[PDB]
Design a protein around this ligand. Structure first.
Ligand SMILES: [Mg+2]
Ligand SMILES: [Mg+2]
Ligand SMILES: [Mg+2]
Ligand SMILES: [Mg+2]
Ligand SMILES: [Mg+2]
Ligand SMILES: [Mg+2]
Ligand SMILES: [Mg+2]
Ligand SMILES: [Mg+2]
Ligand SMILES: [Mg+2]
Ligand SMILES: [Mg+2]
Ligand SMILES: [Mg+2]
Ligand SMILES: [Mg+2]
Ligand SMILES: [Mg+2]
Ligand SMILES: [Mg+2]
Ligand SMILES: [Mg+2]
Ligand SMILES: [Mg+2]
Ligand SMILES: [Mg+2]
Ligand SMILES: [Mg+2]
Ligand SMILES: [Mg+2]
Ligand SMILES: [Mg+2]
Ligand SMILES: [Mg+2]
Ligand SMILES: [Mg+2]
Lengths: 50, 138, 199, 190, 176
RNA sequence: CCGCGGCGGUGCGCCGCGACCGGCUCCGGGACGGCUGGGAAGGCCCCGGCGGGGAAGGUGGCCCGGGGGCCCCGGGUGUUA
RNA sequence: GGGGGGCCACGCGUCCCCCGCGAGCGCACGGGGUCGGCGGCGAUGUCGGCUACCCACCCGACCCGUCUUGAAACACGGACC
RNA sequence: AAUGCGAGUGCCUAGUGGGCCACUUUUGGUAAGCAGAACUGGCGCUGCGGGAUGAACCGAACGCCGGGUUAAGGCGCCCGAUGCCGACGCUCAUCAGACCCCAGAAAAGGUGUUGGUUGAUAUAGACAGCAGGAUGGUGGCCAUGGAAGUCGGAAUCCGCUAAGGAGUGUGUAACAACUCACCUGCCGAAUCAACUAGCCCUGAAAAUGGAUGGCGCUGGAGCGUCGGGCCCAUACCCGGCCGU
RNA sequence: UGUGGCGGCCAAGCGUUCAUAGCGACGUCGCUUUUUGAUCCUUCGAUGUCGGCUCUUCCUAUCAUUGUGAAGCAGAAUUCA
RNA sequence: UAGCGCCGGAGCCUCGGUUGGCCUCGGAUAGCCGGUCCCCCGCCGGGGUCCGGUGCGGAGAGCCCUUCGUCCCGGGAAACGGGGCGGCCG
């Protein structure tokens, strides 16, 4: 794993495979999810999903 | 030499798929291996269907190649397909395979006893016809 | 308790792969008429394919090398063995349950021979594709007993024809007797009709 | 692409009686009987028409290679009709420069001996196909005539006797010697 | 794009960001063929970034709907205009298909290009799909089904279900 | 000491079975509702009714051809019979 | 705001703007399993013993030490105690 | 500003200081499993599932176990899993093809077959296929020993015309000799040319016998585009136990 | 695989005429490891280092012989495949 | 072929696997199957016609056998039937 991507995956608290977290969205968050884009699968959760 | 063809108005029996065991009437031919088909009186919606999953019967009803479900129903009811199909020997042996599957354990014992007695009665007559044919010749 | 599989009209690899699993499942299989097995592809191509097998021998001592068996039964046996773990003792025990033959041997002449539709030519090949008979292929690479097997098969066919006529005679006799005793089997026959046995 | 239907048609004359056993065509008439088997083509043959005046060949769902075989059958059946009604005659000359090609006929036309071809001492004995009769004809100097009902057997025997007299390790453009097919036709005219 | 399953046929409307220069941008509608709306929006941004000078960050998706087949119970001739990449060169085509739905015809077109020219779905670029009258068709594979009294048999019925009677006694029949 | 006594704990010589409860899973069968182009199509009401069109993968007819006992087949004209 | 079904709403006595303890009794999707449920066999041929003796089968499995970027190496050392 | 995390600081200190490989960038060299750099990740130091085999490739990193589910890969038989009535096409090889690294091919071709692009002419009757006619100027002028519609090169115009051009073939010292184009004859529905793209074939020759892993496979068990279902790693979830 | 060896594609020309019977410039695409290089991966606690003799097997890029196609093949002789 | 062979009650060790049987046409697949012989040839066989089936029912999606036992009295079915000693074909 690339070091810049490791740092963002640790700041998102995704240190293990199949870990999930809730992230609020703004420009500073989209520009980090773009960096960790090939290593994650993110989306917009339902109320029943929460 | 072929006798059953795919034309407009050919009754086909669907052998597998979701609409299995049902009669349909071929309305139009979409491609090499697909027909737009519709069974009005056999609870089949008008839909596409591959030729691999239909077994075509010897029933021909006349309607145009683009007429809708109302006219295919009117052609089905005048030709009276649902009783002639049940009168044919194909649906009789379909019904026989359904009865033999529906057959229970008590029905198995009764069929066992009756088949044993009927087989013994047939074999005695078979032996008598053998010795009669042998006594006529030799 | 034993499968007897007729080899005529079957494709060699598909039949061998189907036999190889069933014989590993602890079942005795006897594959009969291996000269009637046929291979997809044209005959000269298949003959060249076997000639390339003939050319592969141990250079320093060919008596230790690959044993190129010329009988069709042993060719089919060699194909089945390549589909088996034959260097282990379950593979050798599987190979012990296979019994391949040319023609119909007189244990299996008065026995009924099963057909595998997943290996037949008419099912698994297009009609406009050429095929090669294993009997002629083996005869042209050095099988010596095509002529003896042909006459011994024909002498069996004319013998089994007489059995077929005598069986059809009994079939006409039983269908006549069924009409003759129809008055007294009437209560036993509708009960077979209402459960689908005789409709 | 696969064409849905391809059909062609042979018009059979009233002198000919034709019958079929699946894809095995039997043709009977004034000169004899010819049988040809067509189980390698995989088509549908139909003897429609009352008194059987017309024969129809069908290919259903065939590609370009499979559609070429229809008029092949329609030509073969026409060849059998022509060979049972009128027959087949292969008139063929023998061309030589110095040595006359000595041709003699044995066993009622089933074997032909060739002597003195290019001055050779070897005798070329040509077996003929069963059903073909060969004879030395008249009114012409050096000409043989082959007779039969089957165009296949007659022309294959003509090819055998033509390839029997071939020139080895010479310029064949200069040594124009042999027995060559001159005319292909029928026994009686139409 | 990966042509997964059958395609659905989407109407996608988008526009640019309203700026002090352009206070209201023109709305742009496109006819996208995609397995889902997530792929459809991405293909919309690909096509519109190729045609206009507008990007995903500089614009927005105003509408993205699946627009259905107006008549999926009649058979129709569909003419499809292609733009694909080969191994050496890129080419345009016009192809014809017979189908009940437009998206089904385009789905058939993707398999047709993959089958005949080994063209993957990312190189295939659909540019116009049109319902074509039967007198305006050109391909003989499609024009041969324009017959009112169409008739053919099923000549060589190969036996499927080869493993439920797997060891059987009677040999199979192909004539029906 | 006796009882095959009651409650409380600990357990069976060995081989086993069943019951219910709880945790984690993989499946199955029903039933209820929201949204869309407030689904698209489709069914029934004489073709839902009336009026006006269009043309073919052309139904009746009519004509031309070829095998029949009026019924089939092929082509042509054409707008609904 | 004016004139049939669910509500974690059920005090009395005023001022006033808007017009601090009721007892009992049981049931349980409730802070990790129990039965207040049973059946067979057992003294010269049988019960239990996973490990340890031998053998059989399936899957896996190249001989260690060392130097080395890299050793099973056709790289060196090594019969055994 | 967002997100996340307890930080700061001082002593003593072993081993190492031969490296190598990969995406991308890149130097020398024809090139190299060659030599030399940058970045990041690996191997070395590391097992496991897959790539048949295997330092580095894909997935995933490891306490001892039970249940479930996956990744990368696969599911004819070896060999767990498609024994789905899987979908649509393409392809016949007398050298078929078959999965990153990766373990073998190019230019040029094919009237094999399939799909396209473009341009013609076709009921004022076309492509085939079976005849006449190709000459008058002219044996053009040109350059030659001479080239006469034909061995070179500037030129390239008329008549009669249904047609007929200083002209595509075979030949002589110049002759002689001979035919496509163009026009009618018969016939009655589509036909012709130039490109381009897939699969297959030619190009395609090495030494022990031989390797899609093998058997084998052609209504694929081959190639392309794609559905469900299924298999299992030490990986993920739940639970037990040990240790930190 | 530079070099050596072998084979192609195009065709200006040679061949009395005539590109392609047989050749083939200017260009260009490949194959092989029977030439020499380039490299340094294995071997320096040693793999006996040139020839010749002897003996066996394999390859085809075929000199002759078997079967054939093409010539600027009349025969004979000789070339190409 | 020497203490060994062939035929007609008891038990003791050891090796194990299994838990009804199918006693048969040839084969075709753009085609089959069975009858019928009123036809025509033969060594009952061969061809044609005609009549029936053909998602195979004269069907392996199949067929046969089916076991709790004994007793009394009936009614169906058998009487040519069930089982027990010497010969002939193949
Ligand atoms: Mg010579
Ligand atoms: Mg192993
Ligand atoms: Mg060392
Ligand atoms: Mg080293
Ligand atoms: Mg080290
Ligand atoms: Mg070591
Ligand atoms: Mg080594
Ligand atoms: Mg050392
Ligand atoms: Mg030593
Ligand atoms: Mg380096
Ligand atoms: Mg490390
Ligand atoms: Mg690792
Ligand atoms: Mg590999
Ligand atoms: Mg596990
Ligand atoms: Mg595998
Ligand atoms: Mg846990
Ligand atoms: Mg060179
Ligand atoms: Mg010249
Ligand atoms: Mg180095
Ligand atoms: Mg050494
Ligand atoms: Mg040595
Ligand atoms: Mg050679």
């Amino acid at each position: 794993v690339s070091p810049k991507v490791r740092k963002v995956l640790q700041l998102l608290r995704l240190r293990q495979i199949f870990n999930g977290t809730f992230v609020k969205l703004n420009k500073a968050s989209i520009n980090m999810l773009r960096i960790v884009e090939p290593y994650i699968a993110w989306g917009y959760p339902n109320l029943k999903s929460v | 030499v072929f006798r059953r063809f795919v034309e407009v108005g050919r009754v086909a029996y669907v052998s597998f798929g979701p609409h299995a065991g049902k009669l349909v009437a071929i309305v139009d031919v979409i491609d090499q291996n697909r027909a737009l088909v519709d069974g009005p009186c056999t609870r089949v919606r008008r839909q596409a269907m591959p030729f691999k999953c239909m077994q075509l019967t010897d029933f021909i009803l006349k309607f145009p190649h683009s007429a809708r479900q109302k006219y295919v129903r009117k052609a089905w009811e005048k030709a009276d397909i649902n009783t002639k199909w049940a009168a044919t020997r194909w649906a009789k042996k379909i019904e026989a395979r359904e009865r033999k599957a529906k057959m229970t354990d008590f029905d198995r014992y009764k069929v066992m006893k009756a088949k044993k007695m009927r087989n013994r009665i047939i074999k005695n007559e078979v032996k008598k016809l053998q010795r009669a044919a042998l006594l006529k010749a030799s | 308790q034993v499968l007897v599989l007729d080899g005529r009209g079957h494709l060699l690899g598909r039949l061998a792969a189907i036999v190889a699993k069933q014989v590993l499942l602890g079942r005795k299989v006897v594959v009969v008429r291996c000269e009637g097995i046929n291979i997809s592809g044209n005959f000269y191509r298949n003959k060249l394919k076997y000639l390339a097998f003939l050319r592969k021998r141990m250079n320093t001592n060919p008596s230790r090398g690959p044993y190129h068996f010329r009988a069709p039964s042993r060719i089919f046996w060699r194909t089945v063995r390549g589909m088996l773990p034959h260097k282990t003792k379950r593979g050798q025990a599987a190979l012990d349950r296979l019994k391949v033959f040319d023609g119909i041997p007189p244990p299996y002449d008065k026995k009924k021979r099963m057909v595998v539709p997943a290996a037949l030519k008419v099912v698994r090949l297009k009609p406009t594709r050429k095929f090669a008979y294993l009997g002629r292929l083996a005869h042209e690479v050095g099988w010596k007993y095509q002529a003896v097997t042909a006459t011994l098969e024909e002498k069996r066919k004319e013998k089994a024809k007489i059995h077929y006529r005598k069986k059809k005679q009994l079939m006409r006799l039983r269908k006549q007797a069924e009409k003759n005793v129809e008055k007294k089997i009437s209560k036993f026959t509708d009960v077979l009709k209402t459960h689908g046995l005789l409709v | 692409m696969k064409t849905i239907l391809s059909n062609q048609t042979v018009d059979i004359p009233e002198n000919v009686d034709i019958s079929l056993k699946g894809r095995t065509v039997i043709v009977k008439g004034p000169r004899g009987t010819l049988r040809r088997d067509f189980n390698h083509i995989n088509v549908e043959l139909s003897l429609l028409g009352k008194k059987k005046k017309r024969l129809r060949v069908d290919k259903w769902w065939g590609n370009r290679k499979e559609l070429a075989t229809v008029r092949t059958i329609c030509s073969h059946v026409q060849n059998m009709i022509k060979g049972v009604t009128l027959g087949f005659r292969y008139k063929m000359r023998s061309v030589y420069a110095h040595f006359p090609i000595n041709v003699v006929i044995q066993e009622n036309g089933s074997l032909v001996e060739i002597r003195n071809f290019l001055g050779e001492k070897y005798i070329r004995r040509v077996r003929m196909r069963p059903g073909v009769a060969c004879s030395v004809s008249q009114a012409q100097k050096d000409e043989l005539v082959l007779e039969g009902n089957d165009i296949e057997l007659v022309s294959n025997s003509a090819a055998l006797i033509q390839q029997a007299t071939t020139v080895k390790n010479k310029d064949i453009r200069k040594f124009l010697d042999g027995i060559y097919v001159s005319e292909k036709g029928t026994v009686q005219q139409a | 794009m990966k042509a997964s399953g059958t395609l659905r046929e989407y109407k996608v409307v988008g526009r640019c960001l309203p700026t002090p220069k352009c206070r209201t941008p023109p709305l742009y509608r496109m006819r996208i063929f995609a397995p889902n709306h997530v792929v459809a929006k991405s293909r919309f941004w690909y096509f519109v970034s190729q045609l206009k000078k507008m990007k995903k960050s500089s614009g927005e998706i105003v509408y993205c709907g699946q627009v259905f087949e107006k008549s999926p119970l009649r058979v129709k001739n569909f003419g499809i205009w292609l733009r694909y990449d080969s191994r050496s060169g890129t080419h345009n085509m016009y192809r014809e298909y017979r189908d009940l739905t437009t998206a089904g015809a385009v789905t058939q077109c993707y398999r047709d290009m993959g089958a005949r020219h080994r063209a993957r779905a990312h190189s295939i670029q659909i540019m116009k799909v049109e319902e074509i009258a039967a007198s305006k068709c050109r391909r003989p594979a499609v024009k041969q089904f324009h017959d009112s009294k169409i008739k053919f048999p099923l000549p060589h019925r190969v036996l499927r279900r080869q493993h439920k009677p797997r060891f059987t006694t009677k040999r199979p029949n192909t004539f029906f």
